[PDB]
Amino acid sequence: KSKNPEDVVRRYMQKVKNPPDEDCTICMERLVTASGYEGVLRHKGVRPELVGRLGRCGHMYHLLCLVAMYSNGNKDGSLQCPTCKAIYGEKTGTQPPGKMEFHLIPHSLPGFPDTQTIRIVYDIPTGIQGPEHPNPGKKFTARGFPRHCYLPNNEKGRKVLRLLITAWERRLIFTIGTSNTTGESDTVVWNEIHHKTEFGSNLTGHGYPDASYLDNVLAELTAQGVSE
Ligand SMILES: NC(=O)c1ccc[n+]([C@@H]2O[C@H](COP(=O)([O-])OP(=O)(O)OC[C@H]3O[C@@H](n4cnc5c(N)ncnc54)[C@H](O)[C@@H]3O)[C@@H](O)[C@H]2O)c1
Ligand SMILES: [Zn+2]
Ligand SMILES: [Zn+2]
């Protein structure tokens, strides 16, 4: 679905014909007068007097104000109510094309005796940045692929796997930007969902044992809108 500010906001806002004489808590003008936003998106945009009720919570704003607020964020397809902090829509990312594969291997991770291991492989080729990327039309590099990572095959690890698959489909596992490890720009980097790439030790900090990891990555997934 379109992630553009006007389309996203219009998707979740229900028109109010007779708004009350109360403050829009985005622009702090009354809902019965024009939006206080005067930036570039007002020109030939949403009529400034239009007011809507947002999503399930029903909080009311000038439509133009929520368009501006959404535009000043990540524009990831999710829309947060500034009053009650409920989030509407599905957060998706800018991960480029590639493949995600997984299967079981007959080896136990440190701290998970008597288990098999879910081995996940991500493979992302180089390509051309799209309009969603920092430098559209410029090449992006993809270093160190295929990238292997590991989860124990237990109840919680399988839950994490299910959610990682969802995050992958929502283009949230990788992004295009600058590597904090190499300094290279215009390159495919891990996003904000940590993966364990070191199997039998934790000298890198990205390995095992780590008794907190599964709960930590579940929290990271929830923060990116990926929950069960
Ligand atoms: N030519 C190469 O072999 C080459 C070059 C660059 C990166 N890489 C691979 O990518 C890693 C660097 O990460 P990046 O450039 O994508 O993003 P990054 O360095 O900008 O870090 C982004 C996120 O990924 C985490 N992260 C960093 N290294 C990780 C690792 N080995 N395993 C799991 N998570 C890691 C970070 O904590 C952070 O949360 C390298 O360690 C390597 O595995 C390989
Ligand atoms: Zn307003
Ligand atoms: Zn609300």
Report which residue type is found at 96. Answer: P
Alpha helices, DSSP H, located in the chain:
5-12, 63-71, 155-169, 213-223
Residue pair 129/139 in contact by the 8 Å Cβ criterion: yes
**Which of 123, 181, 191, 198 has the most ligand 1 atoms within 8 A of CB, as the residue to mutate?**
181
Beta-ladder partners of 105:
117
Report which residue type is found at 192. Answer: E
Resolution in A: 1.7
- Which of 60, 55, 69 minimizes the C-alpha distance to 21? 60
Residue pair 97/142 in contact by the 8 Å Cβ criterion: no
**What is d(CA 207, CA 204) in angstroms, rounded to the nearest whole number?**
7
**Domains by residue range for the chain, with CATH:** 5-88 (3.30.40.10), 99-224 (3.30.390.130)
Residue 218 DSSP symbol: H
CB of 216 shorter than 6 A to ligand 1: no
CB of 14 shorter than 6 A to ligand 1: no
Both tokens assigned to 193: 């969902």
Residues with beta carbon < 5 A to ion ligand 2? 24, 26-27, 35, 62, 65
If phi over 0 gives left and psi between -120 and 50 gives alpha, with beta otherwise, what is residue 93? beta
CB of 180 shorter than 6 A to ligand 1: yes
